[PDB]
Amino acid sequence: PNIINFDTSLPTSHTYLGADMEEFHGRTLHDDDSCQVIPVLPQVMMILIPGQTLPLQLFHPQEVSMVRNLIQKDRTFAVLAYSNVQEREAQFGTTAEIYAYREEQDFGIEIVKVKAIGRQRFKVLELRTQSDGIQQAKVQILPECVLPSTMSAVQLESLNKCQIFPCSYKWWQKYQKRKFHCANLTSWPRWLYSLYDAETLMDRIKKQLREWDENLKDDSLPSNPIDFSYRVAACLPIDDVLRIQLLKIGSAIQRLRCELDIMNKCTSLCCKQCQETEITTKNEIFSLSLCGPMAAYVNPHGYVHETLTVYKACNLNLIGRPSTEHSWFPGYAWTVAQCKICASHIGWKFTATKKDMSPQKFWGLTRSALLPTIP
Amino acid sequence: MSYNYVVTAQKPTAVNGCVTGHFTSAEDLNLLIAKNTRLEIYVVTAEGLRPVKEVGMYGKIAVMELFRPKGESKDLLFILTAKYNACILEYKQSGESIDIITRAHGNVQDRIGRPSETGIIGIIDPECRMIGLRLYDGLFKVIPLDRDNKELKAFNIRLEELHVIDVKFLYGCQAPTICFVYQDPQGRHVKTYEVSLREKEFNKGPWKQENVEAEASMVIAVPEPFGGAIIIGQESITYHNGDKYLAIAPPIIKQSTIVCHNRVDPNGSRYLLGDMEGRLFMLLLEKVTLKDLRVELLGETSIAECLTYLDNGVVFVGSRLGDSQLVKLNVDSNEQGSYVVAMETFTNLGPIVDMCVVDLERQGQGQLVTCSGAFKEGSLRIIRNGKLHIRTVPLYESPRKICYQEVSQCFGVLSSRIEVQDTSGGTTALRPSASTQALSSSVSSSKAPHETSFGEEVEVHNLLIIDQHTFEVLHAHQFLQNEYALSLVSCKLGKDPNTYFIVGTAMVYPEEAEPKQGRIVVFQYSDGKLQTVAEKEVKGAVYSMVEFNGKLLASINSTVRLYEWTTEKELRTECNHYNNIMALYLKTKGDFILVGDLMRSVLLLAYKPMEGNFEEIARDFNPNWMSAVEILDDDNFLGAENAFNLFVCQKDSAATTDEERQHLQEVGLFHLGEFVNVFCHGSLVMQTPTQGSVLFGTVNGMIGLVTSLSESWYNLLLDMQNRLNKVIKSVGKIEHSFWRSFHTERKTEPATGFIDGDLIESFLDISRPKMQEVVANLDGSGMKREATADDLIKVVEELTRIH
Amino acid sequence: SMNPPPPETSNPNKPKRQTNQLQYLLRVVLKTLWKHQFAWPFQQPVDAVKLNLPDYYKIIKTPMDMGTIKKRLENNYYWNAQECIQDFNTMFTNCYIYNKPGDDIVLMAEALEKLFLQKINELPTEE
Ligand SMILES: COC(=O)C[C@@H]1N=C(c2ccc(Cl)cc2)c2c(sc(C(=O)NCCCCCCCCNC(=O)COc3cccc4c3C(=O)N([C@H]3CCC(=O)NC3=O)C4=O)c2C)-n2c(C)nnc21
Ligand SMILES: [Zn+2]
Numbered sequence A: 001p002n003i004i005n006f007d008t009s010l011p012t013s014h015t016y017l018g019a020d021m022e023e024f025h026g027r028t029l030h031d032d033d034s035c036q037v038i039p040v041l042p043q044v045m046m047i048l049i050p051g052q053t054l055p056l057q058l059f060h061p062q063e064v065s066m067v068r069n070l071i072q073k074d075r076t077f078a079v080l081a082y083s084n085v086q087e088r089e090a091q092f093g094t095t096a097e098i099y100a101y102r103e104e105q106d107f108g109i110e111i112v113k114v115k116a117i118g119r120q121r122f123k124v125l126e127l128r129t130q131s132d133g134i135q136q137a138k139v140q141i142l143p144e145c146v147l148p149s150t151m152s153a154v155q156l157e158s159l160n161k162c163q164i165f166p167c168s169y170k171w172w173q174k175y176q177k178r179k180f181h182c183a184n185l186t187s188w189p190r191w192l193y194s195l196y197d198a199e200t201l202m203d204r205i206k207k208q209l210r211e212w213d214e215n216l217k218d219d220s221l222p223s224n225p226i227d228f229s230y231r232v233a234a235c236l237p238i239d240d241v242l243r244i245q246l247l248k249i250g251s252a253i254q255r256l257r258c259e260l261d262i263m264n265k266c267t268s269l270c271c272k273q274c275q276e277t278e279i280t281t282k283n284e285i286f287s288l289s290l291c292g293p294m295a296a297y298v299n300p301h302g303y304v305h306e307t308l309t310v311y312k313a314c315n316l317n318l319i320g321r322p323s324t325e326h327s328w329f330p331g332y333a334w335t336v337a338q339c340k341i342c343a344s345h346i347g348w349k350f351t352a353t354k355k356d357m358s359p360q361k362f363w364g365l366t367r368s369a370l371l372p373t374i375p
Numbered sequence B: 001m002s003y004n005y006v007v008t009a010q011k012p013t014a015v016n017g018c019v020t021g022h023f024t025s026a027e028d029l030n031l032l033i034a035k036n037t038r039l040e041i042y043v044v045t046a047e048g049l050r051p052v053k054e055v056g057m058y059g060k061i062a063v064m065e066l067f068r069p070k071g072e073s074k075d076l077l078f079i080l081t082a083k084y085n086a087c088i089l090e091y092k093q094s095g096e097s098i099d100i101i102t103r104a105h106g107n108v109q110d111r112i113g114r115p116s117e118t119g120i121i122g123i124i125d126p127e128c129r130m131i132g133l134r135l136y137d138g139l140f141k142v143i144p145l146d147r148d149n150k151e152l153k154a155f156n157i158r159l160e161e162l163h164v165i166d167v168k169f170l171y172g173c174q175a176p177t178i179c180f181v182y183q184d185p186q187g188r189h190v191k192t193y194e195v196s197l198r199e200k201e202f203n204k205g206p207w208k209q210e211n212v213e214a215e216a217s218m219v220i221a222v223p224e225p226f227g228g229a230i231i232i233g234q235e236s237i238t239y240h241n242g243d244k245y246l247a248i249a250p251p252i253i254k255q256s257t258i259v260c261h262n263r264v265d266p267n268g269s270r271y272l273l274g275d276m277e278g279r280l281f282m283l284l285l286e287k288v289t290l291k292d293l294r295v296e297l298l299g300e301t302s303i304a305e306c307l308t309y310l311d312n313g314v315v316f317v318g319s320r321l322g323d324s325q326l327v328k329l330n331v332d333s334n335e336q337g338s339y340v341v342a343m344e345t346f347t348n349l350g351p352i353v354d355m356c357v358v359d360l361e362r363q364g365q366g367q368l369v370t371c372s373g374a375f376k377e378g379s380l381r382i383i384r385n386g387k388l389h390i391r392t393v394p395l396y397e398s399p400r401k402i403c404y405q406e407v408s409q410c411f412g413v414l415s416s417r418i419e420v421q422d423t424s425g426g427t428t429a430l431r432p433s434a435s436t437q438a439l440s441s442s443v444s445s446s447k448a449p450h451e452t453s454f455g456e457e458v459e460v461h462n463l464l465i466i467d468q469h470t471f472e473v474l475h476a477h478q479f480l481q482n483e484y485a486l487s488l489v490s491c492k493l494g495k496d497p498n499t500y501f502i503v504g505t506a507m508v509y510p511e512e513a514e515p516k517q518g519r520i521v522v523f524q525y526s527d528g529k530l531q532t533v534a535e536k537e538v539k540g541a542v543y544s545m546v547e548f549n550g551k552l553l554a555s556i557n558s559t560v561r562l563y564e565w566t567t568e569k570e571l572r573t574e575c576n577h578y579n580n581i582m583a584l585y586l587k588t589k590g591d592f593i594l595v596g597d598l599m600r601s602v603l604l605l606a607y608k609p610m611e612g613n614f615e616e617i618a619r620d621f622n623p624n625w626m627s628a629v630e631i632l633d634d635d636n637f638l639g640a641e642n643a644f645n646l647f648v649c650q651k652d653s654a655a656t657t658d659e660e661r662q663h664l665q666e667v668g669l670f671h672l673g674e675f676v677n678v679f680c681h682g683s684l685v686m687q688t689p690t691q692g693s694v695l696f697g698t699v700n701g702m703i704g705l706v707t708s709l710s711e712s713w714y715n716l717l718l719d720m721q722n723r724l725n726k727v728i729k730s731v732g733k734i735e736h737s738f739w740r741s742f743h744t745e746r747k748t749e750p751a752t753g754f755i756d757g758d759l760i761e762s763f764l765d766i767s768r769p770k771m772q773e774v775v776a777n778l779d780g781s782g783m784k785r786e787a788t789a790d791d792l793i794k795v796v797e798e799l800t801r802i803h
Numbered sequence C: 001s002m003n004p005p006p007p008e009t010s011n012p013n014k015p016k017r018q019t020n021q022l023q024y025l026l027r028v029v030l031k032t033l034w035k036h037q038f039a040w041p042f043q044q045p046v047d048a049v050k051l052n053l054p055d056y057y058k059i060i061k062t063p064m065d066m067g068t069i070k071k072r073l074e075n076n077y078y079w080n081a082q083e084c085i086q087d088f089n090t091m092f093t094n095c096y097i098y099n100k101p102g103d104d105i106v107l108m109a110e111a112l113e114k115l116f117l118q119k120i121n122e123l124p125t126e127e
Helices: A061-072 A157-162 A168-179 A181-185 A190-194 A198-210 A225-234 A240-248 A252-265 B711-727 B736-740 B757-764 B768-774 B789-800 C020-034 C066-074 C081-098 C104-120
Strands: A035-040 A053-058 A076-084 A089-104 A111-129 A135-141 A268-271 A278-281 A294-298 A304-310 A316-323 A332-339 A345-352 A361-366 A370-373 B004-010 B017-021 B030-035 B038-044 B049-056 B061-067 B076-081 B085-094 B097-107 B121-124 B130-134 B139-144 B155-158 B164-169 B177-184 B187-196 B201-204 B218-221 B229-232 B237-241 B244-248 B258-263 B270-275 B279-286 B292-300 B306-309 B314-318 B324-329 B340-346 B354-358 B367-372 B379-385 B388-394 B398-405 B410-421 B427-429 B440-443 B458-467 B473-478 B483-491 B500-507 B518-526 B529-538 B542-548 B551-556 B559-565 B571-578 B585-589 B592-596 B601-608 B613-621 B626-631 B636-641 B645-650 B665-671 B676-681 B691-698 B703-708 B754-756
Touching: A035 A061, A035 A111, A053 A061, A053 A294, A053 A304, A061 A076, A061 A089, A061 A111, A076 A111, A076 A135, A076 A240, A089 A240, A157 A181, A157 B258, A168 A181, A168 A190, A168 A198, A181 A190, A198 A225, A198 A252, A225 A240, A225 A252, A240 A252, A278 A361, A316 A345, A332 A361, B004 B665, B004 B757, B017 B061, B017 B306, B017 B314, B030 B061, B030 B314, B049 B097, B061 B121, B076 B121, B121 B164, B130 B164, B164 B218, B177 B218, B218 B258, B237 B292, B244 B292, B258 B306, B270 B306, B292 B340, B354 B398, B354 B676, B354 B691, B367 B398, B379 B398, B398 B483, B410 B483, B440 B529, B458 B483, B458 B500, B473 B529, B483 B551, B500 B542, B518 B542, B518 B551, B542 B585, B551 B585, B571 B613, B585 B626, B592 B626, B601 B636, B626 B676, B626 B691, B636 B676, B665 B736, B665 B754, B711 B736, B711 B754, B711 B757, B711 B768, B736 B754, B754 B757, B757 B789, B768 B789, C020 C066, C020 C081, C020 C104, C066 C081, C081 C104
Parallel strands: A035 A076, B004 B754, B440 B473, B483 B542
Antiparallel strands: A035 A135, A053 A111, A076 A089, A089 A111, A111 A135, A268 A278, A268 A370, A294 A304, A304 A361, A316 A332, A332 A345, A345 A361, B004 B703, B017 B030, B030 B038, B038 B049, B061 B076, B076 B085, B085 B097, B121 B130, B130 B139, B139 B155, B164 B177, B177 B187, B187 B201, B218 B229, B229 B237, B237 B244, B258 B270, B270 B279, B279 B292, B306 B314, B314 B324, B324 B340, B354 B367, B367 B379, B379 B388, B398 B410, B410 B427, B410 B458, B458 B473, B483 B500, B500 B518, B518 B529, B542 B551, B551 B559, B559 B571, B585 B592, B592 B601, B601 B613, B626 B636, B636 B645, B645 B665, B676 B691, B691 B703
């Protein structure tokens, strides 16, 4: 637990990628249901969520050429959500728009470091590997299914003037009783329609997130249910199949419902290789980054890890000596952490370099190594 | 691929709006009533109302206002539909032929815009200079009322006030001026804006913005000589006319929120006000300038959806929750202290929350028992075909579910009543109802922090055993505290010859968003007393229960469970199925099970008796609000979804690919125009081109019937529909395909797999030349069989004989 | 699973000196390559057991890594710059021999060799 004085804005900056990159302010969004021909990055194996910051380091000449071509055009590439990545099977995905880039000379080879952000979900229609070896994807933009209020079709016109509204539990009781009154016209009561109300689910998830982060919901958390749902999904430490099932969801209400069901059910995080070795619990999860408790970071050899920060973790051995080289969190030294039983890499133990920092130590576990578990 | 036929058996009885004016003649006083898709025109006589016209439109009437511009001899009628079809109509009668001609029409929907929370608002400027529409937030649509605007062209003006609650056109203004109540982070205020047609913009209003009540909801434009505007909230009634600011806070209106009004005197001296609890108050304006405001409780009527003053103290009260009324007001109060005397009552079946089919009287002749109304307007309705004879049994509390038990010759009905918190420690009912005036009553045994509050309403749920002959409330069993009953079934289980009443419940608490505790209670009714035979505790809400081949199929949140009835008269779990969704809707046919979610998440399972579990057959996830589901046959499933639509999904048993065998193909879409609440298998005609019979009850009291057809008959009736649409003049000139098209704000597709039975039945009313036009130049035998007018008359008569 | 002992770095019988070339190779070249972000695979002998590469020391007959070169420079194991340059070249050549063109480690070794050659062209004259 304890208190924090680290400054949560530093991990989001990805300062380990060197000096200040060239930043882009323009935004390119394609119309819904429209088809686009987007290039696919060959070495990206992550299941990207819209709004999630993705850092990359590319040194292959083909990758650097493709990145230059994208920077010269719309700065958008396709990140395939692979169901079976060994055979490179992909049915869904998410676009990523490059918002920062930096090519570095005085270097052994031409290398480019990139910060992009997920934008639009999509369904993969066609995959064609070009003669260059790089592959293109003919892609259909998936639309955000926004459904109206469940009372809109069963609303009394005389009560239309009562639908605008000016101890939180009493406030929510009054909200439920006033917004879903006309539920007495249907076969279902008010408290059932509350289970499908965007704001009620958003407030329950806000409570569950207040359990994790001390940043107030006044500013950090978005108000739109779609953006809120994507922000929550970007920081949920779940396996790849559950994340794929969550990306397939098009309606924000279903997304929030599934997210709160996950937050209620899965309470332990075990080793994926062990399945029977508890590593941490939901209670030790804490947010050290503005993007939440879990964020995507890139390492010196090009691998992207979704790191979830926790205060404590058990059943882990520490390999090697601590190092500050290319550390994802400035001011902390990492130490490789393996499972006590199967020796699989679970994450790193980050220890503060200065004695005045808090927390003095924490754990960053990679999402690909964890498995959620219900007791 | 679906081939279905849907037809209306009872037109909507709920009243959503009523106006008075001079529409048929300048000397006649006309009363116009809107019943969703129906428009009724009456002439106000000394005795009462003389019916002069009834028409049907291809839309849901959202705005209905009369207005008389300069030069017109009598009033015109402006009508806007739910699909944003606006029109201006005029009454025309020559001898006996009455025709509602269309003076103007057009679609006012914008390509971009979010529909407002307060819904559609339609106002007309007093001097008939323009029509104002409030459809989307931040935009005000203006339709200039010139003589050349037959297409009803309109332009939008930007609104800095994004959350407008109510708006009215003020009287006595040189320029058309609107006065509206809006809300901002500072609170609720009232503002005014002049509408410039030359600039097509807004100009500063006559008086500055005033800070009003936090619950200011209603705006009333006072006519001359008073002028100004009255703002009505939950606690205060204010009046603003430039320098004139008059606020009153009568406590008699603090009990309930006033939701409707109507002008009595043409100069605006007296007004009628109706609250949510059915109370009718009189607002008096004392006088060049306004002297004072006064509120007098006139009495109690039905829960008023709309009020209108006719003449000679006669007032029409249009109600959707209950029967409509014609009431008489008197100068002197009676013996109980109420100036209101009920003259006449008009049946209203809305809302229909549940229903069932019973052969009460003559065997073979079916009757329909429905749970209608809500609160003190709750009742049971017994409907049979003679057009339709309806018997009413008032309950004075809200009915929710119903089922029939033949062996005991009685009905089981789930009901709920509202009670206020007691001053000491408990709850007190607001009025005597069926649950409190039963010949016998009982309560449940057993198996809450921050208790009670200050006079806050609480729902008390009861099971009512009602005799099928006399309809006396034989028994009224009350459930536990904080217990909500959801499902009800009457059936025999296992080898037990007794027929039981099974009720599924849920424990609801304010701290729990989702119920984690519930009951399945098994009662037996015999010798005029209800006893609890069995009781099972489940870890969730029992949303639905179904008799499944001598077993009990229950839906406990996300789980579908099968119970067996033991010899010790206990419920034994046989098998479970854990789903990705919460099992809201449960239906069965043989060994097939249909599971449904509020967001159109459909699942089809099959019971494997040799293995003793459930096996997934198919599913379909398309997010859209639902309301009711039913199984048409082994392969077809009917449902009602968002925006008053019906749909039919189909499976392929044999099929070709196991990946395709697990998908339910959407084979039918239709725009009904009603919000269906209940589907049930049954028919009302004495026991053919049609196969099956599924009745459905809706919110506006409309009752419908759906049946299945063959491919040849479906194609023939589709061609007939196209021809009839080509020949029939629509009121407001609304396209039939546009009205029947599956309409949501996300998508709009043409209707498929459905035959509009009302359109086909309208073929018998047109003239013989129109019949020959339709049958002009028209595949069961394998080739091409010709068709004359008499053949189609016989076909349509045979199709009408099914309802 | 031989994984032999690392190459020797100290020899008391071996004479030592601080040539200008070797002090440049240590203070500039090795310090530049050691802090590079692609240096880590070469900072220690190849652990053929943990990497599951039983054929590595059957193909690579002259193992070499930057940790060995660092310890040899710090212990003054070399007599002249040619030995250290040959050790670097042996490391790079071993990396290219065992792996395949286009592999990630091959590109990393190519980058390091390019930077090494660009630093070695400024080798100072002996004092
Ligand atoms: C299949 O194999 C073959 O084909 C033959 C074979 N191949 C290879 C080879 C290489 C690269 C790739 Cl790609 C693939 C293959 C290979 C070798 S020898 C070799 C090796 O020596 N290994 C074991 C030694 C371990 C390193 C010693 C410690 C150095 C200190 N380390 C750093 O300081 C750098 O930092 C790193 C490094 C890695 C990962 C991370 C970081 C780091 O900081 N972080 C995070 C922490 C949190 C944060 O906040 N930020 C971050 O960035 C990381 O996650 C290898 C691997 N080899 C050779 C030579 N010839 N042939 C082959
Ligand atoms: Zn493990």
